[PDB]
Design a protein around this motif. Structure first.
Motif, PDB file in Angstrom:
ATOM      1  N   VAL A   1     -16.516  31.425 -29.549  1.00  0.00           N
ATOM      2  CA  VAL A   1     -16.157  30.061 -29.936  1.00  0.00           C
ATOM      3  C   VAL A   1     -17.198  29.448 -30.863  1.00  0.00           C
ATOM      4  O   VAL A   1     -17.084  28.299 -31.292  1.00  0.00           O
ATOM      5  CB  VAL A   1     -15.905  29.172 -28.712  1.00  0.00           C
ATOM      6  N   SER A   2     -18.246  30.215 -31.138  1.00  0.00           N
ATOM      7  CA  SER A   2     -19.176  29.882 -32.197  1.00  0.00           C
ATOM      8  C   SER A   2     -19.573  31.168 -32.910  1.00  0.00           C
ATOM      9  O   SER A   2     -19.564  32.258 -32.325  1.00  0.00           O
ATOM     10  CB  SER A   2     -20.407  29.107 -31.673  1.00  0.00           C
ATOM     11  N   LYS A   3     -19.867  31.039 -34.203  1.00  0.00           N
ATOM     12  CA  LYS A   3     -20.377  32.185 -34.948  1.00  0.00           C
ATOM     13  C   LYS A   3     -21.728  32.606 -34.399  1.00  0.00           C
ATOM     14  O   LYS A   3     -22.030  33.802 -34.314  1.00  0.00           O
ATOM     15  CB  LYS A   3     -20.481  31.872 -36.448  1.00  0.00           C
ATOM     16  N   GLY A   4     -22.539  31.632 -33.977  1.00  0.00           N
ATOM     17  CA  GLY A   4     -23.833  31.969 -33.411  1.00  0.00           C
ATOM     18  C   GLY A   4     -23.740  32.806 -32.149  1.00  0.00           C
ATOM     19  O   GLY A   4     -24.570  33.697 -31.930  1.00  0.00           O
ATOM     20  N   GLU A   5     -22.715  32.561 -31.328  1.00  0.00           N
ATOM     21  CA  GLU A   5     -22.508  33.344 -30.118  1.00  0.00           C
ATOM     22  C   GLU A   5     -22.449  34.853 -30.401  1.00  0.00           C
ATOM     23  O   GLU A   5     -22.950  35.670 -29.611  1.00  0.00           O
ATOM     24  CB  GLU A   5     -21.239  32.829 -29.448  1.00  0.00           C
ATOM     25  N   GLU A   6     -21.846  35.247 -31.530  1.00  0.00           N
ATOM     26  CA  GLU A   6     -21.715  36.670 -31.852  1.00  0.00           C
ATOM     27  C   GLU A   6     -23.055  37.369 -32.094  1.00  0.00           C
ATOM     28  O   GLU A   6     -23.132  38.595 -31.954  1.00  0.00           O
ATOM     29  CB  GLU A   6     -20.840  36.830 -33.089  1.00  0.00           C
ATOM     30  N   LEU A   7     -24.114  36.623 -32.402  1.00  0.00           N
ATOM     31  CA  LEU A   7     -25.429  37.218 -32.611  1.00  0.00           C
ATOM     32  C   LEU A   7     -26.096  37.640 -31.314  1.00  0.00           C
ATOM     33  O   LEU A   7     -27.129  38.307 -31.378  1.00  0.00           O
ATOM     34  CB  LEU A   7     -26.337  36.203 -33.298  1.00  0.00           C
ATOM     35  N   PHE A   8     -25.524  37.314 -30.149  1.00  0.00           N
ATOM     36  CA  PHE A   8     -26.155  37.593 -28.869  1.00  0.00           C
ATOM     37  C   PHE A   8     -25.449  38.642 -28.025  1.00  0.00           C
ATOM     38  O   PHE A   8     -25.784  38.787 -26.848  1.00  0.00           O
ATOM     39  CB  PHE A   8     -26.280  36.295 -28.067  1.00  0.00           C
ATOM     40  N   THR A   9     -24.496  39.408 -28.592  1.00  0.00           N
ATOM     41  CA  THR A   9     -23.703  40.302 -27.746  1.00  0.00           C
ATOM     42  C   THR A   9     -24.464  41.532 -27.261  1.00  0.00           C
ATOM     43  O   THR A   9     -24.073  42.117 -26.247  1.00  0.00           O
ATOM     44  CB  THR A   9     -22.429  40.732 -28.468  1.00  0.00           C
ATOM     45  N   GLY A  10     -25.532  41.939 -27.940  1.00  0.00           N
ATOM     46  CA  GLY A  10     -26.336  43.064 -27.507  1.00  0.00           C
ATOM     47  C   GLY A  10     -27.702  42.637 -26.989  1.00  0.00           C
ATOM     48  O   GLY A  10     -27.905  41.496 -26.555  1.00  0.00           O
ATOM     49  N   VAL A  11     -28.642  43.564 -27.025  1.00  0.00           N
ATOM     50  CA  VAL A  11     -30.041  43.254 -26.730  1.00  0.00           C
ATOM     51  C   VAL A  11     -30.725  42.818 -28.020  1.00  0.00           C
ATOM     52  O   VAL A  11     -30.687  43.532 -29.040  1.00  0.00           O
ATOM     53  CB  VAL A  11     -30.735  44.467 -26.098  1.00  0.00           C
ATOM     54  N   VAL A  12     -31.389  41.661 -27.986  1.00  0.00           N
ATOM     55  CA  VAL A  12     -31.936  41.018 -29.179  1.00  0.00           C
ATOM     56  C   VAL A  12     -33.434  40.990 -29.038  1.00  0.00           C
ATOM     57  O   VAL A  12     -33.961  40.572 -27.999  1.00  0.00           O
ATOM     58  CB  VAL A  12     -31.389  39.577 -29.323  1.00  0.00           C
ATOM     59  N   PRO A  13     -34.210  41.417 -30.048  1.00  0.00           N
ATOM     60  CA  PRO A  13     -35.673  41.327 -29.951  1.00  0.00           C
ATOM     61  C   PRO A  13     -36.138  39.887 -30.089  1.00  0.00           C
ATOM     62  O   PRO A  13     -35.532  39.071 -30.793  1.00  0.00           O
ATOM     63  CB  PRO A  13     -36.170  42.220 -31.101  1.00  0.00           C
ATOM     64  N   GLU A  32     -43.752  38.827 -26.981  1.00  0.00           N
ATOM     65  CA  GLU A  32     -42.723  39.700 -27.518  1.00  0.00           C
ATOM     66  C   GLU A  32     -41.888  40.235 -26.371  1.00  0.00           C
ATOM     67  O   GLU A  32     -42.387  40.399 -25.256  1.00  0.00           O
ATOM     68  CB  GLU A  32     -43.455  40.842 -28.253  1.00  0.00           C
ATOM     69  N   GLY A  33     -40.629  40.540 -26.683  1.00  0.00           N
ATOM     70  CA  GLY A  33     -39.838  41.204 -25.677  1.00  0.00           C
ATOM     71  C   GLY A  33     -38.416  41.227 -26.155  1.00  0.00           C
ATOM     72  O   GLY A  33     -38.142  41.351 -27.338  1.00  0.00           O
ATOM     73  N   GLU A  34     -37.490  41.086 -25.203  1.00  0.00           N
ATOM     74  CA  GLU A  34     -36.085  41.227 -25.587  1.00  0.00           C
ATOM     75  C   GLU A  34     -35.225  40.415 -24.654  1.00  0.00           C
ATOM     76  O   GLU A  34     -35.610  40.174 -23.506  1.00  0.00           O
ATOM     77  CB  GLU A  34     -35.566  42.656 -25.594  1.00  0.00           C
ATOM     78  N   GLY A  35     -34.077  39.978 -25.185  1.00  0.00           N
ATOM     79  CA  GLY A  35     -33.127  39.176 -24.419  1.00  0.00           C
ATOM     80  C   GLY A  35     -31.749  39.817 -24.410  1.00  0.00           C
ATOM     81  O   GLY A  35     -31.290  40.342 -25.422  1.00  0.00           O
ATOM     82  N   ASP A  36     -31.043  39.630 -23.287  1.00  0.00           N
ATOM     83  CA  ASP A  36     -29.675  40.140 -23.038  1.00  0.00           C
ATOM     84  C   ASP A  36     -28.851  38.938 -22.549  1.00  0.00           C
ATOM     85  O   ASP A  36     -28.753  38.744 -21.329  1.00  0.00           O
ATOM     86  CB  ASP A  36     -29.743  41.248 -21.982  1.00  0.00           C
ATOM     87  N   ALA A  37     -28.353  38.133 -23.499  1.00  0.00           N
ATOM     88  CA  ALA A  37     -27.593  36.931 -23.133  1.00  0.00           C
ATOM     89  C   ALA A  37     -26.346  37.238 -22.313  1.00  0.00           C
ATOM     90  O   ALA A  37     -25.917  36.387 -21.513  1.00  0.00           O
ATOM     91  CB  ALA A  37     -27.254  36.108 -24.371  1.00  0.00           C
ATOM     92  N   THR A  38     -25.756  38.428 -22.504  1.00  0.00           N
ATOM     93  CA  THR A  38     -24.578  38.814 -21.735  1.00  0.00           C
ATOM     94  C   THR A  38     -24.866  38.756 -20.251  1.00  0.00           C
ATOM     95  O   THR A  38     -23.992  38.374 -19.471  1.00  0.00           O
ATOM     96  CB  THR A  38     -24.070  40.180 -22.184  1.00  0.00           C
ATOM     97  N   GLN A  66     -33.464  29.226 -24.475  1.00  0.00           N
ATOM     98  CA  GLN A  66     -32.304  29.007 -23.615  1.00  0.00           C
ATOM     99  C   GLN A  66     -31.015  29.485 -24.259  1.00  0.00           C
ATOM    100  O   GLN A  66     -29.958  29.515 -23.591  1.00  0.00           O
ATOM    101  CB  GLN A  66     -32.273  27.535 -23.241  1.00  0.00           C
ATOM    102  N   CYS A  67     -31.078  29.861 -25.537  1.00  0.00           N
ATOM    103  CA  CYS A  67     -30.007  30.642 -26.146  1.00  0.00           C
ATOM    104  C   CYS A  67     -29.721  31.963 -25.427  1.00  0.00           C
ATOM    105  O   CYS A  67     -28.665  32.564 -25.668  1.00  0.00           O
ATOM    106  CB  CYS A  67     -30.322  30.878 -27.629  1.00  0.00           C
ATOM    107  N   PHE A  68     -30.616  32.469 -24.566  1.00  0.00           N
ATOM    108  CA  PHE A  68     -30.316  33.682 -23.805  1.00  0.00           C
ATOM    109  C   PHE A  68     -29.657  33.453 -22.453  1.00  0.00           C
ATOM    110  O   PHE A  68     -29.421  34.422 -21.711  1.00  0.00           O
ATOM    111  CB  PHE A  68     -31.561  34.569 -23.662  1.00  0.00           C
ATOM    112  N   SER A  69     -29.303  32.200 -22.141  1.00  0.00           N
ATOM    113  CA  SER A  69     -28.544  31.908 -20.922  1.00  0.00           C
ATOM    114  C   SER A  69     -27.190  32.612 -20.906  1.00  0.00           C
ATOM    115  O   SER A  69     -26.565  32.796 -21.969  1.00  0.00           O
ATOM    116  CB  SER A  69     -28.257  30.412 -20.880  1.00  0.00           C
ATOM    117  N   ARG A  70     -26.782  33.072 -19.717  1.00  0.00           N
ATOM    118  CA  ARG A  70     -25.397  33.595 -19.572  1.00  0.00           C
ATOM    119  C   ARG A  70     -24.431  32.428 -19.356  1.00  0.00           C
ATOM    120  O   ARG A  70     -24.481  31.761 -18.310  1.00  0.00           O
ATOM    121  CB  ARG A  70     -25.313  34.544 -18.390  1.00  0.00           C
ATOM    122  N   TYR A  71     -23.643  32.111 -20.379  1.00  0.00           N
ATOM    123  CA  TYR A  71     -22.552  31.155 -20.226  1.00  0.00           C
ATOM    124  C   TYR A  71     -21.310  31.937 -19.854  1.00  0.00           C
ATOM    125  O   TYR A  71     -20.826  32.744 -20.672  1.00  0.00           O
ATOM    126  CB  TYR A  71     -22.327  30.366 -21.515  1.00  0.00           C
TER     127      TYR A  71
END
Length: 235
Positions: A1-13, A32-38, A66-71
């Motif tokens: 429902v946002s274009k930005g949401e699509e940038l978080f579907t995998g693991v993001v550095p 440093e590390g990584e986020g998995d918003a899913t 907080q962009c890595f929260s699971r909605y």
């Protein structure tokens, strides 16, 4: 429902940089590390590059994505944080330590290439040299907390508010009242949410091979508190 949401579907550095000054004591932290918003999960490591920190690591946890929260899917239209990406958002806080000093923080969270970067300036004032913060009296742990989010239509963003409870070595609690504002960096439309909260838990650890003052952090965050139609009626 946002274009930005699509940038978080995998693991993001993730990279994090914090420049701080508390009572005039300057410090710098790199992470440093990584986020998995899913799954609402983060793994991060932070180091001081300026020697022993003048404040306890737990006091910096909320400042250091907080962009890595699971909605959950039913709440996806309430995710302001991802909707502001890739251009990002400014996150500002006042953190009032009860009976002690205050932090003011300003951060920019955005994509730089493939990487989500959180760049922070932190100023702390009026701390007590023998208080729980400058005295390093806080346990190296972290409680779970609920972060309450509200829309701020005038600023095209959100506000949040929550109280952090830091366990003190004498069995008491050091409260830290958080007031937060997030505003988009870009011009594009963003999602402005209905009232909800983020359920957050954090585990702090150490790296046996790391010689600098440091913190390893794992976090799990899940959004909650939106209900629809008559769903809760059919139990």
């Amino acid at each position: 429902v946002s274009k930005g949401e699509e940038l978080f579907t995998g693991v993001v550095p993730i990279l994090v940089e914090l420049d701080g000054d508390v009572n005039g004591h300057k410090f710098s932290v790199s992470g440093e590390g990584e986020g998995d918003a899913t799954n609402g999960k983060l793994t991060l490591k932070f180091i001081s590059t300026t020697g022993k920190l003048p404040v306890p690591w737990p006091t910096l946890v909320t400042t250091l994505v907080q962009c890595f929260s699971r909605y959950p899917d039913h709440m996806k239209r309430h995710d302001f944080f991802k909707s502001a990406m890739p251009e990002g958002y400014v996150q500002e806080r006042t953190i009032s330590f009860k009976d002690d000093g205050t932090y003011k923080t300003r951060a920019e969270v955005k994509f730089e290439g493939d990487t989500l970067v959180n760049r922070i300036e932190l100023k702390g004032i009026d701390f007590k040299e023998d208080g729980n913060i400058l005295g390093h009296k806080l346990e190296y742990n972290f409680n779970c907390h609920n972060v309450y989010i509200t829309a701020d239509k005038q600023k095209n963003g959100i506000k949040a508010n929550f109280k952090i409870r830091h366990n003190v070595e004498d069995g008491s609690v050091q409260l830290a009242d958080h007031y937060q504002q997030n505003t988009p960096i870009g011009d594009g439309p963003v999602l402005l949410p209905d009232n909800h909260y983020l359920s957050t838990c954090s585990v702090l650890s150490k790296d046996p091979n790391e010689k600098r003052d440091h913190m390893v952090l794992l976090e799990r965050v899940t959004a909650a508190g939106i209900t629809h139609g008559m769903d809760e009626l059919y139990k």
